Amino acid sequence: YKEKKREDIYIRYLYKLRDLHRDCENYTEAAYTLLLHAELLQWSDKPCVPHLLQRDSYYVYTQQELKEKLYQEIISYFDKGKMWEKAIKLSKELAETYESKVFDYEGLGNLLKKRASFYENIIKAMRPQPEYFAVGYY
Amino acid sequence: YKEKKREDIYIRYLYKLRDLHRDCENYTEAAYTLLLHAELLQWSDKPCVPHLLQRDSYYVYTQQELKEKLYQEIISYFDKGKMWEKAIKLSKELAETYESKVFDYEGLGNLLKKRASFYENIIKAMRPQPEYFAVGYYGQGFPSFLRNKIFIYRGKEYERREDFSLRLLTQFPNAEKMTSTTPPGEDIKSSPKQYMQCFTVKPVMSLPPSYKDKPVPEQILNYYRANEVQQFRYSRPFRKGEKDPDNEFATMWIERTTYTTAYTFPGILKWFEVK
Amino acid sequence: MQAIKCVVVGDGAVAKTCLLISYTTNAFPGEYIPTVFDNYSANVMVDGKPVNLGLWDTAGQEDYDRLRPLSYPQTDVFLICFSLVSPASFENVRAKWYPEVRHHCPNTPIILVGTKLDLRDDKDTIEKLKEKKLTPITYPQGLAMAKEIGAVKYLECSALTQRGLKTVFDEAIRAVL
């Protein structure tokens, strides 16, 4: 579909895959897919197409607001995905958006609370490394 | 000393002033002075001169570390100084330094905790505005930097004009108040018997950058109403035309007086000479 | 943080509005800028905490007696006003202003306030009143009227000098407090 550029159905199966990955609890991969969804959005205000307006809930959802919701979800995923570097990375732009576009400082406070928790998690504990294998199909 | 550029003694009296301001609990001004001290430092590692190595405690103190300590102190000052915008501003570079030069993420966490507290403080509560008065010193008995001079004073949050006038008289013998509030007295541009005059002036709105059209909440603006200001105006009533009985708006002509001082309130001093 | 209701009335020949606006403006004496609208407000601390304030600038001529009392309800204090140099104002207040005020709100801390405190001792004004057979009435009979009402205070001030004017309003605020 991306080759065919028909974006809406692309989003549909993207969400399908997000469902799948959550079923597998592959938090990281679900986060990545949902990010590819979020990547289409912008920090603008006008909702340009209802294509991005999906079936989950249907009302105004300015691109700004939906992008916020997606970023919050992805942050949560990475948090339980134990991958806090990307979490902090995204938190940075999210805080940027709060403080320069919507000016809701409560969101700033909660987000920074979470970012501090992330830094603590990075520094304090440790995480196992996944082994990587090569598979040759013939 | 800054003119003479002899930096070490400059720092010494800078710290003297910091002591003074803390005695006055003028947290903001103490923070500013201590900042001027900190401004000399850099985020480098090598302690370049022991001049900055002051008498408080004397050992290695890489410029990086001392700058960190100063920034922490200034952050605390602003916090109790109830001026959280500068607090957040400095917190930003401090976090930058932690994460890009020393990589102590615990410091990141504590600093961000404090920054969140700052944002909460900005958004939730409110803060009174300090009234601003103009002080015109005249005469000859005034000190050299006071004779025929005009200053602007960052009064308290609720200084009724005559209260501040009383305080100023407490500062001085020859406590007589002029009544031609606008113009100076040429005789008193040379006469002894120091003459003064005081009155409230309007804090002209600042220019919050990148804020000109966004539908920002009021709180940041109300903060900008009084703080980070350099322009001050005073309206001048005047009758110009016929004084017809039922009407006065046929004669009102305001000769506003805009005042610019070299520095921006708030500053190291609760007052400043008009420039 | 809180606010206080406070009405002010009086004959239109004294320009109480000048006093009120000068106080709220914190301007130089005799240097107030008169606006076009009434019912001024301010935000002052008198003791302990700052309070918001609202001054009901009420027109004083007889006709608006239908609209003025509708603002009286739930007014924390009212400030009755006159001109120290106007015996006619005394007639009006002891005869009309004071009685109807006590009628509408028999339950309110009240302070009587003088005006043109300088003009009470203005020799030219005094001689004009004598040649016009009016009396530059002095304090003690004003005190007598205050006792007649037993107002929580009675004060005398002026606009060109603002003397006691701050004392006037601090007493007014602390009347509730």
UniProtKB/Swiss-Prot annotation, chain A:
It is found in: Cytoplasm; Cell membrane; Cell projection, Podosome. The DOCKER domain may mediate some GEF activity. Belongs to the DOCK family. Interacts with CRK and CRKL. Interacts (via N-terminus) with tensin TNS3 (via N-terminus); the interaction increases DOCK5 guanine nucleotide exchange activity towards Rac. Interacts with ELMO1. Guanine nucleotide exchange factor (GEF) for Rho and Rac. GEF proteins activate small GTPases by exchanging bound GDP for free GTP. Along with DOCK1, mediates CRK/CRKL regulation of epithelial and endothelial cell spreading and migration on type IV collagen. This is Dedicator of cytokinesis protein 5. It comes from Homo sapiens. The lineage of its organism: Eukaryota, Metazoa, Chordata, Craniata, Vertebrata. The chain holds residues 1231 to 1368 of 1870 of the full protein.
From Swiss-Prot, chain C:
PROSITE patterns: RHO. It holds the Pfam family Ras. Changing residue 51 to M: In MRD48; decreased substrate adhesion-dependent cell spreading; weak dominant-negative effect. One of its GO terms (biological process) is localization within membrane. Regulated by guanine nucleotide exchange factors (GEFs) which promote the exchange of bound GDP for free GTP, GTPase activating proteins (GAPs) which increase the GTP hydrolysis activity, and GDP dissociation inhibitors which inhibit the dissociation of the nucleotide from the GTPase. GTP hydrolysis is stimulated by ARHGAP30. Changing residue 12 to V: Constitutively active. Interacts with PARD6 proteins. Increases nuclear localization and up-regulates transcriptional activity of NR3C2. Doesn't interact with CYRIB. Increases interaction with GARRE1. There is a cross-link at residues 147, 166 (Glycyl lysine isopeptide (Lys-Gly) (interchain with G-Cter in ubiquitin)). GTP binds at residues 12-18, 31-32, 34-35, 59-60, 116, 118-119, 158-160. Changing residue 64 to D: In MRD48; increased substrate adhesion-dependent cell spreading; constitutively active. Keywords: Cell membrane, Cell projection, Cytoplasm, Disease variant, Glycoprotein, GTP-binding, Hydrolase, Intellectual disability, Isopeptide bond, Lipoprotein, Membrane, Methylation, Nucleotide-binding, Nucleus, Palmitate, Phosphoprotein, Prenylation, Synapse, Ubl conjugation. GTP-bound active form is ubiquitinated at Lys-147 by HACE1, leading to its degradation by the proteasome. Phosphorylated by AKT at Ser-71. The keyword Ion transport does not apply. Changing residue 32 to F: Abolishes AMPylation by Haemophilus IbpA. Coiled coil: none annotated. It is linked to Intellectual developmental disorder, autosomal dominant 48: A disorder characterized by significantly below average general intellectual functioning associated with impairments in adaptive behavior and manifested during the developmental period. MRD48 patients manifest global developmental delay and moderate to severe intellectual disability. This is Ras-related C3 botulinum toxin substrate 1. The lineage of its organism: Eukaryota, Metazoa, Chordata, Craniata, Vertebrata. The gene is RAC1.
